[PDB]
Amino acid sequence: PESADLRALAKHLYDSYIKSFPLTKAKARAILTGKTTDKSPFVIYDMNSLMMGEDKIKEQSKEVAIRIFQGCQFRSVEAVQEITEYAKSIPGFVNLDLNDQVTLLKYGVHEIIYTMLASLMNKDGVLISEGQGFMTREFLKSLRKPFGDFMEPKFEFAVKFNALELDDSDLAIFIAVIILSGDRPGLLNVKPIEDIQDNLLQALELQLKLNHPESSQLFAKLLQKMTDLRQIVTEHVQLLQVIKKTETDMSLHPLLQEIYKD
Partner 1 sequence: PSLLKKLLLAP
Question: Site residues (CB under 8 A) for partner 1?
Answer: 80-81, 84, 88, 94, 98, 101-102, 105-106, 254-255, 258-259
Residue type, 105: L
Strands (E), the chain: 42-44, 121-122, 125-128, 133-136
> Cβ 102 to partner 1, closest distance in Å?
5
> Cβ 103 to partner 1, closest distance in Å?
9
Which is nearer to partner 1, 220 or 237 (by Cβ)? 237
Cα(204)–Cα(96) distance, integer angstroms: 22
Q: Binding-site residues for rosiglitazone, please?
A: 73-76, 110, 236, 260
Cα(249)–Cα(72) distance, integer angstroms: 17
Residue type, 173: I
Which is nearer to partner 1, 78 or 235 (by Cβ)? 78
Which is nearer to partner 1, 101 or 129 (by Cβ)? 101
Looking at the DSSP bridge assignments, the partners of residue 122 are 125
Find all residues with CB under 8 Å of 193, minimum gap 6, and list them. Answer: 96, 100, 104, 180, 181, 182, 187
> Cβ 94 to partner 1, closest distance in Å?
8
Cα(142)–Cα(115) distance, integer angstroms: 24
> Cβ 38 to partner 1, closest distance in Å?
30
Which is nearer to partner 1, 88 or 123 (by Cβ)? 88
Cα(28)–Cα(20) distance, integer angstroms: 15
Which is nearer to partner 1, 47 or 77 (by Cβ)? 77
Q: Binding-site residues, please?
A: 73-76, 110, 236, 260
CA 214 to chain centre: 26
Cα(100)–Cα(55) distance, integer angstroms: 40
> Cβ 262 to partner 1, closest distance in Å?
15
